[PDB]
């Protein structure tokens with residue numbers, strides 16, 4: 206029943222196409238250098254993640270939340286690795302299968318319609334780009350234990366996740382702004398990512414360490430998300446008429462509120478986006 210209440214907030218892939226770049230990447234871009242197009246910045250974000258993973262030819266990369274398959278293809282093409290992708294979306298599964306089958310390679314390419322809970326095959330390296338927000342706090346210990354256990358002695362993982370701060374830390378940066386941010390987060394995890402729950406950077410780090418990972422200083426992507434959300438918002442606005450035709454005025458207003466609102470709270474430093482690297486004890490220096 207509560208699912209039905211959330212099922213209300215389901216939106217066609219066609220709507221997201223009207224604000225996203227041509228790769229349909231629904232995560233923080235990386236504008237390095239600063240004058241990259243959104244689309245180029247999305248390839249630079251993939252490279253930022255993959256370049257941290259010490260990927261060698263013939264290794265297997267696991268992509269947890271593999272989206273439309275952009276990260277896996279880039280991995281196969283750049284690093285000559287086997288790939289396994291996990292997605293819960295039937296549409297993303299079908300697209301990924303086609304993206305991977307198109308690649309000129311002898312490497313193994315696999316996409317599975319399942320969550321990480323059901324995945325227990327040996328892999329060399331793991332990437333997860335803005336899927337972690339959906340796992341839930343109670344599942345973090347199981348997540349990091351699974352990732353540690355499926356990787357070899359030199360295993361590495363990157364997790365990119367939107368984050369909030371502990372209530373105590375939020376209170377420290379103005380009471381007014383603290384309650385305002387909490388209410389906007391509640392809107393995101395009700396109407397935009399139903400059942401979602403933002404971790405803190407500290408949770409991401411400490412759950413990793415409990416599992417046995419070495420965790421260097423997380424990379425903040427805050428200024429890159431501000432630019433991403435600005436372009437998304439401006440793009441949705443430019444396509445207002447088409448967006449309404451495809452869904453409704455309700456859904457257009459909901460997403461403009463989300464995109465403008467996120468840009469605001471990222472600017473006010475009440476939200477962040479953390480790229481966290483997890484190194485197993487035997488990882489290369």
Ligand SMILES: Cc1ccc2oc(=O)ccc2c1
Nearest residue numbers: 218227228229230273296300
């Ligand atoms: C279903 C669908 C159709 C076209 C697309 O174009 C892209 O480049 C990436 C994602 C995508 C997904």
Ligand SMILES: Cc1ccc2oc(=O)ccc2c1
Nearest residue numbers: 338339367393398401402403
């Ligand atoms: C589940 C989920 C995924 C992405 C998110 O991005 C945000 O900025 C805030 C909340 C959030 C929640």
